[PDB]
C-alpha cells in the first residue's frame, strides 16, 4: 500500500523484517539498503543461504523460495531511517519493501 512497515524500538532492541519476492527471481541478488537524499544505498546484496552482514548490526539471508530475512540487532539511534529491500535481476530492479525505523527517546 501507501505506507512503509512503521516500527518503533528503544535502543538495544532488536527486529526482524521478512522482505518477499517471486519464485522467478530466487536466482537474482537482492539488495538491503538505506534511503539517503540521494536514493536507496545500498548495503549489503544477498547469497542464497548466506546470513550476509551490512555494517555491525544488520543481517540480510536469503532463505531461498521467495523469503528475504532481514536481522537488525541491538540497534543504535544512527539506525533510525528508513530502507529497503530490493530485487536486482535481469529485468530490472524493483523496490520490494520499505521499512521506516524510528528510535524511542530515553
Not at 552482514?53 to 532463505?63: I, K, Q, V, W, Y
Not at 531461498?64 to 530492479?93: H, K
Request: net charge neutral.
Amino acid at each position: 500500500g501507501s505506507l512503509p512497515e512503521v516500527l518503533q524500538a528503544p535502543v538495544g532492541s532488536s527486529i526482524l523484517v521478512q522482505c518477499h519476492y517471486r519464485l522467478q527471481d530466487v536466482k537474482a541478488q537482492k539488495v538491503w539498503c538505506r534511503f539517503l537524499p540521494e536514493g536507496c544505498q545500498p548495503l549489503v546484496s544477498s547469497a542464497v543461504d548466506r546470513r550476509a552482514p551490512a555494517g555491525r548490526r544488520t543481517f540480510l539471508t536469503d532463505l531461498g523460495g521467495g523469503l528475504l530475512q532481514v536481522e537488525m540487532v541491538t540497534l543504535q539511534e544512527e539506525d533510525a531511517g528508513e530502507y529497503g529491500c530490493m530485487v536486482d535481476g535481469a529485468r530490472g530492479p524493483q523496490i520490494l519493501h520499505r521499512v521506516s525505523l524510528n528510535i524511542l527517546p530515553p
